[PDB]
Design a protein around this ligand. Structure first.
Ligand SMILES: *[C@@H]1O[C@H](CO)[C@@H](O[C@@H]2O[C@H](CO)[C@@H](O[C@@H]3O[C@H](CO)[C@@H](O)[C@H](O)[C@@H]3O)[C@H](O)[C@H]2NC(C)=O)[C@H](O)[C@H]1NC(C)=O
Ligand SMILES: *[C@@H]1O[C@H](CO)[C@@H](O[C@@H]2O[C@H](CO)[C@@H](O[C@@H]3O[C@H](CO)[C@@H](O)[C@H](O)[C@@H]3O)[C@H](O)[C@H]2NC(C)=O)[C@H](O)[C@H]1NC(C)=O
Ligand SMILES: *[C@@H]1O[C@H](CO)[C@@H](O[C@@H]2O[C@H](CO)[C@@H](O[C@@H]3O[C@H](CO)[C@@H](O)[C@H](O)[C@@H]3O)[C@H](O)[C@H]2NC(C)=O)[C@H](O)[C@H]1NC(C)=O
Lengths: 411, 411, 411
C-alpha cells in the first residue's frame, strides 16, 4: 500500500544530467557549482549549486551536575553514658557524612579507664567527605541525532532543509542522499567535561546509577537540588582494648572516584568538540574528528521521468490526545495521537513527537482510512516542552507537557 | 581468484531501464510498480513490481528467567548452648536466605542474664528475602540479524528472498541492494520486559553475570530450574552488651535491585516492539521507531551487459564432520566442515552453520581444489538444534547437536 | 569554500563505461577483469582490472598483561605479646597478600589459655593468593581502523592504495567507494585470548579498571613490571572465644574472577581471528566472520566530464610545533601543528597525526590564507613513536614523542 516514507527518486540513468558520489567527513562542509546544458535553449546555461553544512551532533541529555573530588575522613566520638542521639558530632556539618553508632555497648574490656559503664553510652563513628571540589560537569546521553543543512539551487529555485544522517532530500529535479556510518557515541554514555565545553571530555560507559559507592565514577555529585552523596564500600569496626577509648576503624575504600579515575586516566576515551551549543535539555556540537565519514550521492535530472518516491495521494490530520511518561528521559514519554486519513484506503507513514523547537521521536503508523489512534514515544525535552503529534512539517494545534523524570538514588 | 560472495551487478548505465535510490525506515514496507518499454515489441509493456517487507529483527537470546522484587529481612536466633547445626531457623524456609553463625562464642559480656555459658552455644544471624514477586521477563541477546523479504517481478518471473540488512538480491535483470545503518541493540545487551512483550522494555548494559549481589540489576532471578539467589553487599555484626541477648546487625544494602532501578527508572533506555514472535532460542519483532532508516538501491537492466557478479564455475559439496561448544551461547559452537571444491583451482566462499529452521553464523572459507577442512562458529540455537554445514541453499545431509551452555553463578 | 576532503567523482551517467555495485564480506577479497571499448580505436581493447584485498582490522591496543587464576587462602598468626611489626608471616612471601592486624587487643575473653595479656600482642590475619597461573593475554582497544588495499588498472596505469572502510579511491577515470557497516568491536572493549592468538578470544565490556576486587574480570594481572593485585570484596573478623586462640574470618568473595567467568562462560561474546599480526602498540587481523559485509561501488568513465571532487588549487605546508598527552592512550596525545595555506583564501582539509609507520588520528582544519595553528588528537602509538603533522601523503620534517600513559591502580 501507499507510503510517503520512501525518500528518494526513480530515474532513467540515460536522462540524468549529473551524478556526484563521494565520501565526506562529518565535520566537513562542501560546495559544488556547475553550469548545466539547457535542453530547450542550448545557449544560456542553467546554474546548479549544492551546499552541505557540517554535520551537527544533537544529544538530548540529562544534566547530572558536577562530579566532586573529596578527602575521606574517619572520626571517633566516645561517651561513657548517654544515648548516641544525645550528642552532636563534628562530622554532622560536612557535605557528606555516614555515621555508625555502637550504642549501649560499654564493657570493662573496651572502656577508657575513667568509664565504669556496662551496657551504656555510645561509640559514634563518623565517615565524612571534605575538601569537596568540583572536577567537571557531567551529562548523560538520552538520544543522538546527526544532521546536515542541505541547500539545492537549480536555476532560480532553492530548497534548504535539515537532513538526518541516513535520509535523502528530494526536489523537483534533484536528489541528495546521505548514508551514515560509525557512531562514536551511544545512548546512555556519560560525558565528563573537566573544563570548558570547548576542551572536550571523557566518555564513561559505567557511571554509577542504581548504586553509587565512594570510589565509583560519579560517586559524589553536586546538583542544583543539593549534594548527592555516595554510600560506602567497606565496613566499620569498633576496636576494643582494656583501659582504652574505643577506636573506630573502616576497612573499605578511602580514595575518591575522581582520584582513582585520574590514576588510570588513559584507560578512557576522549572526545573533542567545536562550536558547542548548550540548551535546556540538549548539547549540540561538531566533532572535529575527520575520520568519521558519510557517503553522499547527488542526482540531477531535469527530465519528466524523474519520480519523487515520497509522493502519494494520502492526506492526514493530527490531534494530540493524551500523554504519560517523563521529559528528559531515555525511557521517554508516550504521546497518544488521533490521526485521520483521507484519499487512501491505507497509508504507512511516520508520526513525530515534537515541541515548538525540536522533534524527539518518530513512530511508523499503519493507518487505515478514517480515524486512527497511534501511540508514539519521544525521548528528551524539558519541563516546558509542549509535545505535539506531527507529520512532515505539520503539527497538531495543541500540545501536552510531560511529567518530571525519576532520577533518584535510594540513599 | 574466484568468489561467489560479491552479491551485486556490473552494468552499462546507458543500458539501464530504471534506477530507484531512496531511504526507507526499517519498520516501513514499500511497493513499486511500473510498465517498462518492451524493446523487441514497443507495443505491449513489461510489468515491473517491487515489494520490500518491513525489516524484522531476529535476536538469538538466552532466557534468563524472571527478575524478582523482594523485601530484605534480618533475624537473630540465640541459644546459650549447643552447636548451630542443632537448631532449625525460621529463615531456612525462605526463597533466598544467607546465614552467618557465631558458634561457641558466648561470654559474660555478651550473654543474656540467664546464660552463664562461656565459649558455648550459637548466635545465628539470618538474612532472608520474602514477598518475592516477578517484575518482568529477562532475555540476553546472543546475536542480532536484520532481514527484509524482497520480492521482484519482471514480466512473468518472480523471485522472493530474505535479504540481510547489508546484502543484495540479484535476478536475471534486477539488482536490489540494502545498506544497513544504526543498530539500537548490541550483543550481550539485556532486555527486561515489565509486562506483555508488546509493551516493550528496557535495555540494560550492566546486568549482573559473574557476581550478583542484592541490589544489582538481575540480583534475584527465578528460572525453571529454581531460584537463583544473590550474594550480599555488606557484612554481618554480632552486637554485644552485658545481660543482653546478642543482636545481629547487617551494614550493607537492604534495597532490592528492582526498587533501586525504579527509583532512577528514567536513567535507562526503553525500546518498543510490534508483532513479537517468541521461539525456543530467539525473539523476533519489528521496531516501530521510524528514525532507523536503511538505504535502498534498485537497478533494472534487460540488456545482455547486465552481469551477476556472484556467478563462478566453482561447485562445492559439504559434510558436517564434528562439533564442540554449546547452543544458546554468545561464545557459540564450533562446527567442523569437510568442503570439497570442483571446477576451480581456488574458491573463496561463505559456509554457514544452520539447523532445519535458521542459520546461526557464517565463515569465509578459502578453498583449494579437492577436499578442505573448515571450522565455522555458530551462535544461538537450542538443545534440539541439529547444526549443519551449509552453502547458499544447500546443506550437508547430517547435523550434530551441541552441548548445553555454562550459565552458572558460583554461589 | 575549497575542500579536498570530498573523495569521489562527478560524472555524466551517459558517459560512463561501467558500474559495479555489490555487497562483499569484510573477510572476502575480490577480483574483476573486463575488456573495455576503445572509443578512439574500436579495434584494440583497453583492459580494466580491479583488486580488493580482504579488510584488515587494525586495533591500537594497551597490553594489559596476563590474567591470572589463583586460590584464596586465609591464615591466622597470634602472638600474646609484641607489636605486629615484630613478626614475620608466611603470607608475606605470596604473589598477592592482604594483611589485617588486630594489635594490642588481647583480653581474657579472647586469649588462648597460656596468654594472660591484656591490651597486648597481635592477631594478624592474612589473605594470600597462590597457585597463580596465567589463563590468557589481555588487550584493551584504544582505537579501531578497517582498511582494504585497492588496486585499479586501466590500460597501462595502475594505482594501489589503502582505503578506509567509508572512504573512496579516485584515479583519472575510475572511482572505487567503500561503505562501511556493522562494527563488532568498540573502543574500550577488552579482549581476552585464552590461547594462541589464532584461536580467538572473548570480548569483555566491564573489565575492572578504577577498582579491581578479587572476583572481578581482570582482578589479578601479571605485567612486565610485576603483579597487579586486587583489593578484597568483603571484610575480616577476629572471632573470639574464652581459652581459645583468636580465629581470623573473612566474609567476602573467595572465588577468583577467572573461575566465576568460566562458570558462566557462555554469557560472553567470542570472536575469531585469522592472520594475526602483533606489533608494539597494535593488533591486526582479519575476522573470518562472513556476515559482516561492506557495500562497494565502482565507476569507470574515460570521458572528459569525469571530475575528481578532491581537486582544489589549495596547497599547504606543515610543521609540528609541540605535543602533550600520552602514547598508548584512549585519551591520546595533542599535537600542535603550524599549517601554512597558499593559493586559496580558505581551505577545509584533514590534518593527520602519524609516526613513521602509521597514522593515529585526523582533525578537520578550517584554514585561512597564510599561517594557521591547528590542534589535532592522536590515539595509540608507543614510546618510540615520533608523531608528525601530516596531510595526504606529506608529513612535517620533525616529530615529537609523547609521554607515558597513566594506567595505575591506586592500591
Ligand atoms: C581533546 O579532548 C581532551 C579531553 O578533554 C583534551 O584534554 C584536556 O585538555 C585540557 C586543556 O589542555 C586539560 O585542562 C587542564 O588545564 C589546566 C590549565 O588550566 C592544566 O594545567 C591541567 O594540566 C589540565 O590538563 C584537560 O585536563 C584535558 N583533559 C583530559 C581528560 O586529558 C584535549 O586537549 C583536546 N584536544 C584538542 C581540543 O585539540
Ligand atoms: C514503549 O516501551 C515502554 C517501555 O516498556 C512502555 O512503557 C511501559 O508501558 C506499560 C503500559 O503503559 C507500563 O505497564 C504498567 O501498566 C500498569 C497497568 O497494568 C500501570 O498501572 C503501571 O503504572 C505500569 O506503567 C510499563 O510500566 C512501562 N514501562 C516502563 C519501563 O516505563 C511504553 O508504553 C511503550 N510505548 C508504546 C508501546 O507506545
Ligand atoms: C573461535 O573463538 C573461540 C573463542 O576463543 C574458540 O574457542 C576456543 O577454542 C580453543 C581451542 O579449541 C580452546 O582452547 C583450549 O584447548 C585445550 C587443548 O590444549 C582444550 O583441552 C581446552 O578444553 C580448551 O578448550 C579455548 O578454550 C576456546 N575458548 C573459549 C572461550 O571457548 C573457537 O575454537 C574459535 N573457533 C574457530 C577458530 O573456528
Amino acid at each position: 500500500g501507499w507510503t510517503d516514507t520512501a525518500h528518494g527518486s526513480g530515474i532513467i540513468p540515460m536522462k540524468t544530467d549529473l551524478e556526484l558520489d563521494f565520501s565526506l567527513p562529518s565535520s566537513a562542509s562542501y560546495t559544488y557549482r556547475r553550469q548545466l546544458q539547457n535542453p530547450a535553449n542550448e545557449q544560456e546555461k542553467i546554474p546548479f549549486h549544492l551546499q552541505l553544512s557540517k554535520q551537527v551532533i544533537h544529544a538530548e541529555i540529562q544534566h547530572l551536575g558536577h562530579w566532586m573530588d573529596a578527602t575521606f575522613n574517619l572520626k571517633t566520638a566516645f561517651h561513657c553514658y548517654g544515648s548516641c542521639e544525645k550528642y552532636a558530632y563534628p562530622w554532622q556539618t560536612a557535605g557528606c557524612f555516614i555515621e555508625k553508632d555502637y550504642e549501649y555497648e560499654t564493657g570493662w574490656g573496651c572502656n577508657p579507664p575513667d568509664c565504669p559503664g556496662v551496657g551504656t553510652g555510645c561509640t559514634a563513628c563518623g565517615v565524612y567527605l571534605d575538601k569537596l571540589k568540583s572536577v567537571g560537569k557531567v551529562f548523560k546521553i538520552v538520544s543522538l541525532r546527526y544532521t546536515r543543512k542541505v541547500c539545492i539551487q537549480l536555476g532560480t529555485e532553492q530548497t534548504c532543509k535539515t537532513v538526518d544522517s541516513n535520509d535523502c532530500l528530494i526536489t523537483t529535479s534533484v536528489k541528495v542522499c546521505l548514508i551514515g556510518t560509525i557512531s562514536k557515541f551511544q545512548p546512555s554514555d556519560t560525558l565528563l567535561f573537566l573544563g570548558p565545553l570547548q576542551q572536550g571530555g571523557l566518555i564513561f560507559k559505567q557511571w554509577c546509577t542504581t548504586t553509587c559507592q565512594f570510589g565509583d565514577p560519579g560517586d559524589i555529585m553536586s546538583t542544583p537540588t543539593g549534594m548527592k552523596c555516595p554510600e560506602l564500600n567497606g565496613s566499620f569496626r569498633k576496636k576494643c582494648a582494656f583501659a582504652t577509648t574505643p577506636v573506630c576503624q573502616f576497612d573499605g575504600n578511602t580514595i575518591s572516584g575522581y582520584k582513582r579515575m585520574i590514576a588510570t586516566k588513559d584507560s578512557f576515551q576522549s572526545f573533542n568538540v567545536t562550536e558547542p551549543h548548550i540548551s535546556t535539555s540538549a548539547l549540540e556540537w561538531i566533532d572535529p574528528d575527520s575520520s568519521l565519514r558519510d557517503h553522499i550521492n547527488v542526482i540531477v535530472s531535469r527530465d519528466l521521468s524523474f519520480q519523487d518516491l515520497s509522493e502519494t495521494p494520502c492526506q492526514i490530520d493530527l490531534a494530540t490526545a493524551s500523554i504519560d511518561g517523563a521529559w528528559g528521559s531515555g525511557v521517554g514519554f508516550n504521546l497518544v495521537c488521533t490521526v485521520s486519513l483521507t484519499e487512501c484506503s491505507a497509508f504507512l507513514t511516520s508520526i513525530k513527537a515534537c515541541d515548538a523547537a525540536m522533534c524527539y521521536g518518530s513512530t511508523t503508523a499503519n493507518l487505515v482510512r478514517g480515524q486512527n489512534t497511534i501511540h508514539i514515544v519521544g525521548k528528551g525535552g524539558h519541563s516546558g516542552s509542549k509535545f505535539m503529534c506531527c507529520h512532515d512539517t505539520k503539527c497538531s494545534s495543541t500540545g501536552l507537557v510531560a511529567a518530571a523524570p525519576h532520577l533518584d538514588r535510594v540513599t
